[PDB]
Amino acid sequence: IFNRDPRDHYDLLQRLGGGGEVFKARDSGDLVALKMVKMEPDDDVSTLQKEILILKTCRHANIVAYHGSYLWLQKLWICMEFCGAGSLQDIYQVTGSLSELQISYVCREVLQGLAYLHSQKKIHRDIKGANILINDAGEVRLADFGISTPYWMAPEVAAVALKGGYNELCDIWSLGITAIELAELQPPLFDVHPLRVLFLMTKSGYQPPRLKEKGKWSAAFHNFIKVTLTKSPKKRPSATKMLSHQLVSQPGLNRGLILDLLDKLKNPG
Ligand SMILES: Cc1nonc1CNC(=O)c1c[nH]c2nccc(Oc3c(F)cc(NC(=O)NCCCN4CCOCC4)cc3F)c12
């Protein structure tokens, strides 16, 4: 970490989104994104610096690269890879749905980042359209919206309360949902209240979900979904195993497909 105003280092060009806040900035002259975070009177910096460590030993082209953090006047700024098309979700919300082939290259890329994260025995915890970033070159980058009364709780409740039951494999499942999300503009049950959906998922009966249209997608896309969305984590394939899958290993898959999508985003019709 460095402790200073980062307005010395970079020029703040423009504001991209709220949450904390993210800004396009320039260093070197090269373009970075600055995630700003307002910390309260209760917030202790000692703990965020253990999560900041985990971000500096994340080197992967399929991972939004972390460049170095800054503490300044009750504000924490994270410098970061700039992906100037935003997220897949800001993209389909304009372009409509993605093609099977587009969706397939996105899925191979995510798996590439995942496999490396699981390599490092980390877990993304939050795979979705909103956390997959697209540079002006149509390359794909998993971003970190996530990792970026206990006194009375017992140790078992405490443990489960940091870790969740998150297993590296729940990242796979989530990708499955993300593919459907990208196919159909919405994940399963977006028009169903979220508690109900959490309950529905735990009955001994719950069938994993699937694409609505059947004709419109290859048998390989169908298998991809069937196999990623296995209920049992013992039986769900690893990300290195999923990179074998025929949906993500077929020829033709390259940034060109997404370049198409970025044009589609400028010139509709
Ligand atoms: C992961 C993430 N998601 O959002 N913010 C983050 C954290 N940023 C990053 O890690 C980034 C790292 N590098 C970046 N380079 C460019 C942008 C980046 O962040 C983004 C950002 F700042 C803004 C947006 N888009 C946005 O806010 N859109 C408004 C959508 C409004 N919807 C609401 C629902 O109803 C429909 C309309 C995307 C980013 F990816 C990053």
Author numbering: 8 to 26, 29 to 36, 39 to 159, 175 to 295
Copied sentences from the primary study:
We found that replacement of the pyrimidine with ureas such as 2 increased potency 10-fold, delivering single digit nanomolar inhibitors (IC50 = 7 nM). Protein X-ray crystallography confirmed that the urea moiety interacts in a bidentate hydrogen bond with the Asp101 side chain in MAP4K1 (Asp112 in the surrogate kinase MST1). Ureas synthesized from cyclic amines, which reduced overall H-bond donors by one (not shown), also displayed more than a 10-fold decrease in activity, highlighting the importance of the two hydrogen bonds for overall potency.
Mitogen-activated protein kinase kinase kinase kinase 1 (MAP4K1) is a serine/threonine kinase that acts as an immune checkpoint downstream of T-cell receptor stimulation. MAP4K1 activity is enhanced by prostaglandin E2 (PGE2) and transforming growth factor beta (TGFβ), immune modulators commonly present in the tumor microenvironment. Therefore, its pharmacological inhibition is an attractive immuno-oncology concept for inducing therapeutic T-cell responses in cancer patients. Through its proline-rich domain, MAP4K1 binds to a diversity of adaptors in hematopoietic cells, including those involved in T-cell receptor (TCR), B-cell receptor, and cytokine-induced signaling. The function of MAP4K1 has been studied most extensively in the context of T-cell activation.
